[PDB]
Design an enzyme around this catalytic site. Structure first.
Site, PDB file in Angstrom:
ATOM      1  N   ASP B  65      24.265  31.342  -2.738  1.00 25.71           N
ATOM      2  CA  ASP B  65      22.945  31.951  -2.652  1.00 25.71           C
ATOM      3  C   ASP B  65      21.917  30.985  -3.223  1.00 25.71           C
ATOM      4  OD1 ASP B  65      20.650  33.596  -2.812  1.00 25.71           O
ATOM      5  OD2 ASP B  65      21.808  35.328  -3.500  1.00 25.71           O
ATOM      6  N   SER B 142      10.656  22.509  10.835  1.00 20.14           N
ATOM      7  CA  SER B 142      10.035  23.173  11.945  1.00 20.14           C
ATOM      8  C   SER B 142       8.770  22.449  12.331  1.00 20.14           C
ATOM      9  CB  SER B 142       9.685  24.597  11.628  1.00 20.14           C
ATOM     10  OG  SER B 142       8.903  25.082  12.693  1.00 20.14           O
ATOM     11  N   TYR B 155       5.351  31.569   6.429  1.00 16.10           N
ATOM     12  CA  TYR B 155       6.444  30.723   7.002  1.00 16.10           C
ATOM     13  C   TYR B 155       6.013  29.247   7.116  1.00 16.10           C
ATOM     14  CZ  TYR B 155       9.789  28.642  10.335  1.00 16.10           C
ATOM     15  OH  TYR B 155      10.661  27.778  10.970  1.00 16.10           O
ATOM     16  N   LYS B 159       7.390  25.820   5.387  1.00 14.06           N
ATOM     17  CA  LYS B 159       7.809  24.626   6.138  1.00 14.06           C
ATOM     18  C   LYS B 159       6.984  23.364   5.830  1.00 14.06           C
ATOM     19  CE  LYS B 159      10.794  26.604   6.666  1.00 14.06           C
ATOM     20  NZ  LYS B 159      12.294  26.701   6.594  1.00 14.06           N
TER      21      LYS B 159
HETATM   22  C1  LIG Z   1       1.342  25.351  21.277  1.00 15.39           C
HETATM   23  O1  LIG Z   1       1.636  26.567  21.962  1.00 15.39           O
HETATM   24  C2  LIG Z   1       2.294  27.550  21.251  1.00 15.39           C
HETATM   25  C3  LIG Z   1       3.459  27.274  20.514  1.00 15.39           C
HETATM   26  C4  LIG Z   1       4.099  28.307  19.799  1.00 15.39           C
HETATM   27  C5  LIG Z   1       3.575  29.629  19.843  1.00 15.39           C
HETATM   28  C6  LIG Z   1       2.413  29.872  20.566  1.00 15.39           C
HETATM   29  C7  LIG Z   1       1.776  28.830  21.272  1.00 15.39           C
HETATM   30  O2  LIG Z   1       0.647  29.023  22.016  1.00 15.39           O
HETATM   31  C8  LIG Z   1       4.177  30.820  19.101  1.00 15.39           C
HETATM   32  C9  LIG Z   1       5.578  30.577  18.563  1.00 15.39           C
HETATM   33  C10 LIG Z   1       5.645  29.148  17.996  1.00 15.39           C
HETATM   34  C11 LIG Z   1       5.343  28.031  19.045  1.00 15.39           C
HETATM   35  C12 LIG Z   1       5.285  26.656  18.410  1.00 15.39           C
HETATM   36  C13 LIG Z   1       6.459  26.416  17.477  1.00 15.39           C
HETATM   37  C14 LIG Z   1       6.878  27.567  16.533  1.00 15.39           C
HETATM   38  C15 LIG Z   1       5.861  27.624  15.356  1.00 15.39           C
HETATM   39  C16 LIG Z   1       8.315  27.487  16.029  1.00 15.39           C
HETATM   40  O3  LIG Z   1       8.519  26.571  14.946  1.00 15.39           O
HETATM   41  C17 LIG Z   1       8.706  28.932  15.696  1.00 15.39           C
HETATM   42  C18 LIG Z   1       8.892  29.141  14.199  1.00 15.39           C
HETATM   43  C19 LIG Z   1       9.387  30.502  13.775  1.00 15.39           C
HETATM   44  C20 LIG Z   1      10.565  31.022  14.296  1.00 15.39           C
HETATM   45  C21 LIG Z   1      11.023  32.276  13.862  1.00 15.39           C
HETATM   46  C22 LIG Z   1      10.310  33.010  12.895  1.00 15.39           C
HETATM   47  C23 LIG Z   1       9.123  32.488  12.352  1.00 15.39           C
HETATM   48  C24 LIG Z   1       8.371  33.281  11.290  1.00 15.39           C
HETATM   49  N1  LIG Z   1       7.048  33.265  11.153  1.00 15.39           N
HETATM   50  O4  LIG Z   1       9.019  33.948  10.526  1.00 15.39           O
HETATM   51  C25 LIG Z   1       8.682  31.225  12.801  1.00 15.39           C
HETATM   52  C26 LIG Z   1       7.641  29.820  16.366  1.00 15.39           C
HETATM   53  C27 LIG Z   1       6.982  28.841  17.343  1.00 15.39           C
END
Ligand SMILES: COc1cc2c(cc1O)CC[C@@H]1[C@@H]2CC[C@]2(C)[C@@H](O)[C@@H](Cc3cccc(C(N)=O)c3)C[C@@H]12
Ligand SMILES: NC(=O)c1ccc[n+]([C@@H]2O[C@H](COP(=O)([O-])OP(=O)(O)OC[C@H]3O[C@@H](n4cnc5c(N)ncnc54)[C@H](OP(=O)(O)O)[C@@H]3O)[C@@H](O)[C@H]2O)c1
Ligand SMILES: NC(=O)c1ccc[n+]([C@@H]2O[C@H](COP(=O)([O-])OP(=O)(O)OC[C@H]3O[C@@H](n4cnc5c(N)ncnc54)[C@H](OP(=O)(O)O)[C@@H]3O)[C@@H](O)[C@H]2O)c1
Ligand SMILES: COc1cc2c(cc1O)CC[C@@H]1[C@@H]2CC[C@]2(C)[C@@H](O)[C@@H](Cc3cccc(C(N)=O)c3)C[C@@H]12
EC number: 1.1.1.51
Lengths: 277, 278
Positions: B65, B142, B155, B159
């Site tokens: 843990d 990430s 989050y 990161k």
């Molecule tokens: C650039 O275009 C986009 C990329 C993205 C989104 C929306 C967009 O318009 C929403 C999700 C996100 C991606 C870019 C990369 C991201 C940030 C990844 O690293 C993902 C990280 C992630 C995964 C699971 C849970 C969480 C959290 N907040 O707990 C965060 C979630 C992804």
């Protein structure tokens, strides 16, 4: 009415200077709440406010300990105007050392104060800004939040964290009418047996090389809090404020070169040479 | 001798698939300590190991843990070989919502687990790597540690924190021969709306489900598998001269470049808002 400003960490350094600098504005547009971890330390703040003859009613002090959301809440309620127009999250700690030499308590405190404390402030105060459709938030940033530096691992971790938190919010808040800005500051003017016992011979060597070279960098590059305070003003007065303001251009070169190389390794190579001589 | 690997967060996702991928590698060169917060969750790990024929002694599970430095210490003592050749810091929490809606304990948890946890790992294992003059540390990173995203504020903070932590260490560790790398993952495929609404205004409630809908389309188009991500870990392990960052996908490098082009952050905020919200 007056623009209402609430600033944390106001007992010394940047907070003090910004608090009195706004309270003594001759247009007298600012009602300043200067907040302190301990109200008993406020004496020095009141002296600097007299020295500029801050009109009575221009500056109020509150206790606000950012580790505790009850103290945050209580402080929010003492704002008798029932709004904040400018929130200044400035409270922060340092931590310098070889990673494995730092106590678990210390690491957590830095994170609790610099990151979680800022989250508590924003949680308390953003909703009323959002409701009104306007508000400014200024956050004391570091060049340490844009580039990593040896023996500041937990400090840079907390300052990088602020970059992520504030950049994440800014993306949402732009159409809510709330404007978030980071003031990126460089350095600011204000036994060895242990280190060895808790580290190893090579780390120990590099840490005293660091402490020596670091002191040379503050001597050249350190800024006075009053100069930094002016940068907060500029941001504050800006009609369309941007996400970051730099109090110095001294580190734009190392910053641009860091951004040239995604893999990260030119930055590491260079910073190593430049730090370790 | 084989390569000793110790990996956090092995009950599912990247930690589980990387752990079995290495223990089942046709080289037979990896001895993997797959660690878990709660031993009762080890079911899927063993069935996967069985499925890929991990040989005897290629895989052992330990309770670890990252919130608990005695747990971390006890795990380090169970490493019979007296050394770890690859440390993978992959344990991590998510947290997704309007910042004012997230509970103070949940916020404190993410940080304790993602950031202080990693610190505790590095405290317990870096010294032995330093005095040996060898070691590789891989940290699950990430794209959310490189650019901020709406409703991922805590989050992302966490990161981003790892980026600063790791980059500060990397500057130091360069002459020790201990290599530190971030594996920058895009989306990987593996609050109750009630609570949310109470604590947030109406426009932010709507904006959040707007973000959730765009998010699910990004995950459908662009998400990678843990199996695909695990290959990048392995490429980084084997690299003779590893870099600080490995990107699992090229997809976000354009946005990232734009973000870096404009130090004032203005362009990124406009662009990312349009990107996310239209
Ligand atoms: C650039 O275009 C986009 C990329 C993205 C989104 C929306 C967009 O318009 C929403 C999700 C996100 C991606 C870019 C990369 C991201 C940030 C990844 O690293 C993902 C990280 C992630 C995964 C699971 C849970 C969480 C959290 N907040 O707990 C965060 C979630 C992804
Ligand atoms: O150099 P520097 O200007 O950075 O000085 P510093 O002493 O390193 O700290 C900066 C400011 O942050 C404040 N602060 C620290 N912990 C706090 C807490 N738990 N709640 C509220 N404020 C806190 C400090 O107050 P104190 O010095 O009053 O603790 C100070 O005014
Ligand atoms: O992609 P993912 O699947 O969400 O992986 C996250 C991993 O981190 C682990 N984790 C979360 N909190 C932890 C803690 N305190 N100590 C160790 N591992 C932890 C999770 O195990 P759990 O899901 O069992 O927490 C999981 O295996
Ligand atoms: C490449 O130039 C250098 C810059 C630097 C150093 C050494 C160099 O060779 C050591 C100090 C460090 C600067 C860059 C700017 C930095 C990161 C500033 O923002 C300072 C941040 C800071 C300020 C006060 C306390 C702490 C702390 N306790 O860790 C950290 C510390 C500064």
């Amino acid at each position: 009415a007056r623009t209402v400003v609430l600033i944390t960490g106001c007992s010394s350094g940047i907070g003090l200077h910004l608090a009195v600098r706004l309270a003594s504005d001759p247009s007298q547009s600012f009602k300043v709440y200067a907040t302190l971890r301990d109200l008993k330390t406020q004496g020095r703040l009141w002296e600097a406010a007299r020295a500029l003859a801050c009109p009575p009613g221009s500056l109020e002090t509150l206790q606000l300990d950012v580790r505790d959301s009850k103290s945050v809440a209580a402080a929010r309620e003492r704002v008798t105007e029932g709004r904040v127009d400018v929130l200044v999250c400035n409270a922060g700690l340092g931590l310098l050392g070889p990673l494995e030499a730092l106590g678990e308590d210390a690491v957590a405190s830095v994170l609790d104060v610099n990151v979680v404390g800022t989250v508590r402030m924003l949680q308390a105060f953003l909703p009323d800004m959002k409701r009104r459709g306007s508000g400014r938030v200024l956050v004391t940033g570091s060049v340490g939040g844009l580039m990593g530096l040896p023996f500041n691992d937990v400090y840079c971790a907390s300052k990088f964290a602020l970059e992520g938190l504030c950049e994440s919010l800014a993306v949402l808040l732009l159409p809510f009418g709330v404007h978030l800005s980071l003031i990126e500051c460089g350095p600011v003017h204000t036994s060895p047996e242990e280190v060895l016992d808790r580290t190893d011979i090579h780390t120990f060597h590099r840490f005293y090389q660091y402490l020596a070279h670091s002191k040379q960098v503050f001597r050249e590059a350190a800024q006075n809090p009053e100069e930094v305070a002016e940068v907060f003003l500029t941001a504050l007065r800006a009609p369309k404020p941007t996400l970051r303001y730099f109090t110095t251009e001294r580190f734009l070169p190392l910053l641009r070169m860091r951004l040239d190389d995604p893999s990260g390794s030119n930055y590491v190579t260079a910073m190593h040479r430049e730090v370790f001589g």
